[PDB]
Amino acid sequence: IVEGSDAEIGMSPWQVMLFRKSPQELLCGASLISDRWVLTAAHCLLYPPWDKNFTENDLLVRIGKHSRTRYERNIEKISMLEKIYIHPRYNWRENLDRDIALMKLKKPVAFSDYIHPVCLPDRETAASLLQAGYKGRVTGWGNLKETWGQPSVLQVVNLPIVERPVCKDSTRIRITDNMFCAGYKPDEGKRGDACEGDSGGPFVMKSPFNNRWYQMGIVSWGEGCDRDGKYGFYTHVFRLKKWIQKVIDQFG
């Protein structure tokens, strides 16, 4: 996360770290959506241009974390994966359309002060809140700058959703309805973005109707990190919810 701040303790208790077993390293962010299911970006698990194709046994999830590198004894919980599900129409060849995946844990994780699931949006919450200018929050342990470096603890940044024509005009990539973009404009006097290593983590909004946090987006892509005139692109979770529900109903 570029131009963010340290998270408060328990500020993002749905935050998940995807951790490679060997070598031991950060792979991606992710989020907890129930006691058995974790949501992330497909490109965290499958990205052939970069020779990325992880299987279940390659990875661990670490839940309840704050420090990036520490083993947070008596706080974090480490879970093994039972199965990965990547969206069948994920488009890694062109534009990262439908950049979404689910991971089922081998055993349910116990909730605590530090471990708690985020809500997935309903149609009405999505319609109300996914509007230009409305701000969401992005969290992760990814790099602090595009070129360098890396944070001691989880980072947090609040960013406004951007008008779709501005998103489209910022890139040569074809933007789809399964994406939205967020970030400040050059003239706006504030900045911030996701970066490498933040992939797969959540873009959340706090509903003013029921005071619950909803995951509206997944950290997907950006041309660099925090570049003037570029924006971060997020998977539109609500638009892909029917698939989420089909997977959980069939395999949960």
Added chain:
Amino acid sequence: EADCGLRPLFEKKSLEDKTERELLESYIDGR
């Protein structure tokens, strides 16, 4: 899921984090 999105150390105790108000202030719909 019935309890989703309510943080033990914040909403469940009626404590606000230091920047959540920035999000609320950006939400025009439904005022």
Added chain:
Amino acid sequence: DFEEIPEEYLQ
């Protein structure tokens, strides 16, 4: 750069 995690998780 990461602290070793307990061996139980790597089995």
